[PDB]
Amino acid sequence: NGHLQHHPPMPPELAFQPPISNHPAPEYWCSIAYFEMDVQVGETFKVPSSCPIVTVDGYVDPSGGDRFCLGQLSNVHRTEAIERARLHIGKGVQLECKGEGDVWVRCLSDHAVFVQSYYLDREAGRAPGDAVHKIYPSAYIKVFDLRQCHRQMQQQAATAQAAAAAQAAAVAGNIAPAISLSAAAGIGVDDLRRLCILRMSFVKGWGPDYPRQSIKETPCWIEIHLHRALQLLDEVLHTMPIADPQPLD
Amino acid sequence: NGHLQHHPPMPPQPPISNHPAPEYWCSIAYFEMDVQVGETFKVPSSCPIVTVDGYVDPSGGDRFCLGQLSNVHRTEAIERARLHIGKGVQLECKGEGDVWVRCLSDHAVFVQSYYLDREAGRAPGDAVHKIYPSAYIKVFDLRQCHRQMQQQAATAQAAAAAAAGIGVDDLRRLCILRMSFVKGWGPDYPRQSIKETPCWIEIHLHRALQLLDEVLHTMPI
Amino acid sequence: NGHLQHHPPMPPISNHPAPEYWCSIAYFEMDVQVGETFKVPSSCPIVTVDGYVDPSGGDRFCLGQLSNVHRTEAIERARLHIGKGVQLECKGEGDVWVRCLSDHAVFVQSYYLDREAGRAPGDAVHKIYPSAYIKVFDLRQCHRQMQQQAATAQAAAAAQAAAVAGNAPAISLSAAAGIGVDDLRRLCILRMSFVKGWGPDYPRQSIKETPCWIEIHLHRALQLLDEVLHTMPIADPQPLD
Secondary structure (H helix, E strand, O other): OOOEEEEOOOOOOOOOOOOOOOOOOOOEEEEEEEEEOOEEOOOOEEEEOOOOEEEEEOOOOOOOOOEEEOOOOOOOOOOHHHHHHHOOOOOOEEEEEEOOOEEEEEEOOOOOEEEEOHHHHHHOOOOOOOOEEEEOOOOEEEEEOHHHHHHHHHHHHHHHHHHHHHHHHHOOOOOOOOOEEOOOOOOOHHHHHHHHEEEEEEOOOOOOOOOOOOHHHOOOEEEEEEHHHHHHHHHHHOOOOOOOOEEOO | OOOEEEEOOOOOOOOOOOOOOOOEEEEEEEEEOOEEOOOOEEEEOOOOEEEEEOOOOOOOOOEEEOOOOOOOOOOHHHHHHHOOOOOOEEEEEEOOOEEEEEEOOOOOEEEEOHHHHHHHOOOOOOOEEEEOOOOEEEEEOHHHHHHHHHHHHHHHOOOOOOOOOOOHHHHHHHHEEEEEEOOOOOOOOOOOOHHHOOOEEEEEEHHHHHHHHHHHHHOOO | OOOEEEEOOOOOOOOOOOOOEEEEEEEEEOOEEOOOOEEEEOOOOEEEEEOOOOOOOOOEEEOOOOOOOOOOHHHHHHHHOOOOOEEEEEEOOOEEEEEEOOOOOEEEEOHHHHHHHOOOOOOOEEEEOOOOEEEEEOHHHHHHHHHHHHHHHHHHHHHHHHHHOOOOOOOEEOOOOOOOHHHHHHOOEEEEEEOOOOOOOOOOOOHHHOOOEEEEEEHHHHHHHHHHHHOOOOOOOEEOO
């Protein structure tokens, strides 16, 4: 039963709905970090908001800008296995930013790329993180929706702030001493941020059907942080009630 | 011996050198245990105040948000800690290169500082200073650091007559600050080093390092 | 046998635009990278890497200030002797010279110096003596070597194709898009250890076993290699037949 979702290639008025936020656009629309197993290789690559398309391939130009080459990168802990997989990255993939912050992926490599996206999990009726999406060579699909993300943010944020109030009353449960309770400032933070991050492995997938159980076990993957989505999540976090000390009495 | 110093809240000359002001008055590196997480944050001399909180805005400038950073080695203990960083702290740069800390967080912050060691009358590096929420304390005096480095290098340049001869890594420590969030360390705690705490940062003071470099050229080791 | 080589004191290749930086410098202690990668602007042809502490950066990279929680007594000892370190200079389009300013020698790994010394590619350690000023990299020579080496790789790859052909037509055979890329890029990289050397004549058998070394990425060179890789015949799967 499908943990591995296949995404083969399918050949082929934003003036009525305002921007999700009046907030000014970030200087970089995303930042990419390349990994080899559980070790990060190289520096984090920042893509300016002016460059709506960024390519990540196995070539060697270091010039940066709108192309992140992983071919010239060194790693003193690189194994023979990692060398083999680095052989097939080739043309790699393209990451394209549409609208205010939507992201599309185009696989230019001759080999498939495996992706982790909450958006693609929803579209598949799967639960968050309970699926690895395989994008086939030459395929071109949408992997992130800003609106979908924003709606999920507000939902999950509200949920957590309520569960905090729950635990707060579940223990105000004796009586009684002079004890004050307060909600941890930062609930669900590490859970909400995952909604603004994308991850993808080259050539090799992971999961049930595979010998690798997490992306951390794959030879070469990248983690993409979506800055616009992160600004919104920050905005959201700042619209919640301040953790005011509460006497349980 | 009162290794942990308590700093609760208490509501209220020309440049040392002509050396050109730095492009950044400091650099901050976030750590979770003994692993550095994220890239090094550099603060422009233009932004005298910088905020290090546990939120998620990835923008630079004067706000370093630790909430969005990832760590493949992160554990439950660390995630549980990051949970209480909240508003974090503010580092302020006064004068040529003095530094103040303002705990905005709901929880205490533990600072390692030679200036505070000297003020508390403790052996250098033999103390941890607990900064309480809302407290606004001075954690670094440039002028004093400058006298310290000169005199300390001066004694090492003479200790060569012959240990007493200290190296560059010993002196650079005068220009660095370290502080833990939520969890403290020392004899009163299960952790003996800041390197064992779940969340901490290391601050490099550029103006202080420039003066140090200037000193290492006149008083070589 | 001579693994250790002694060096005591004694028209554009492309219309492609110059790089933003001419080189990237990464500092290492043993097998751990310390600090962030230093990038040198094309405007600063000379960069100085020493053991002092100015963090100002720009055209001077000071390793004295950098921290490393995994550092040991042995490494602190070694960082003591870097002192004025070395000085890397870029002449013309992409030639690199080195000037040892340290009181101690520097050990360089340079395919170009291996080529001049008459030793197997990368099978030698070049010891630069205090005050020495030598050319450690030749752009022209590198470019010429990249092309021939890339051409050879393709041939050997297409050779392992006609091989698997000497077994069924129901299957298509294809070559990796990254054949030889790892070997080719090393020609555009320089590595050097301060104070301690490595090799048969030493207790340390590789640079990653040394206390403090740096890896330099030559940008103009890497650009030329990129164009070369892009002029290679696209990978077209051929049926076994």
